Amino acid sequence: MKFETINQESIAKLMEIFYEKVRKDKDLGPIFNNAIGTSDEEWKEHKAKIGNFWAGMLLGEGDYNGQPLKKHLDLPPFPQEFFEIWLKLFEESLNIVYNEEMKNVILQRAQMIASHFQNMLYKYGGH
Numbered sequence: 298m299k300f301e302t303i304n305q306e307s308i309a310k311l312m313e314i315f316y317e318k319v320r321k322d323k324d325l326g327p328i329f330n331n332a333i334g335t336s337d338e339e340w341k342e343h344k345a346k347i348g349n350f351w352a353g354m355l356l357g358e359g360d361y362n363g364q365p366l367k368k369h370l371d372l373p374p375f376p377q378e379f380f381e382i383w384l385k386l387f388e389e390s391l392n393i394v395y396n397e398e399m400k401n402v403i404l405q406r407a408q409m410i411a412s413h414f415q416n417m418l419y420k421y422g423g424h
């Protein structure tokens with residue numbers, strides 16, 4: 298009932314579950330909607346792309362070829378606190394799809410990226 302492995306099937310289930318939580322989210326939903334659209338197909342094309350990102354990260358295969366940091370830099374600014382929401386929802390989704398062992402491998406990878414995005418996107422300083 299829970300994946301003890303990482304494959305196209307498990308990642309596709311992860312994308313389904315996570316981006317449905319994101320779409321329904323009070324804080325994240327508008328950001329994503331303003332960026333990709335509201336149609337089911339636009340959301341399917343986004344899940345496909347992020348699915349390819351994760352396959353490249355986790356399986357070493359797929360057609361993801363974009364610049365993830367640049368993309369988030371180019372987004373209209375949003376609060377740093379949203380990274381907490383994103384991670385909470387992602388961990389919930391992983392907990393549905395994967396056993397504890399696999400879940401923790403992928404969460405760790407997401408945490409590392411989120412931490413890198415945050416150090417790059419917010420000074421936390423002043424100027």
Ligand code: HEM
Pocket residue numbers: 325328329332333346347350362363364365368369372375379380381383406407408410411414
């Ligand atoms: C506050 C948290 C985050 C928000 C609000 C957010 C938002 C978005 C949005 C709106 C897009 C669509 C970009 C567009 O169509 O212009 C996007 C793309 C993407 N996101 Fe995020 N993101 C967040 C965190 C993350 C994290 C932590 C990761 C990785 C672990 C990630 C991975 C990606 C990737 C790979 C893309 C595709 C970029 C491309 O088109 O090449 N995001 N994100």
Ligand SMILES: [C-]#N
Pocket residue numbers: 347
């Ligand atoms: C970005 N999800």
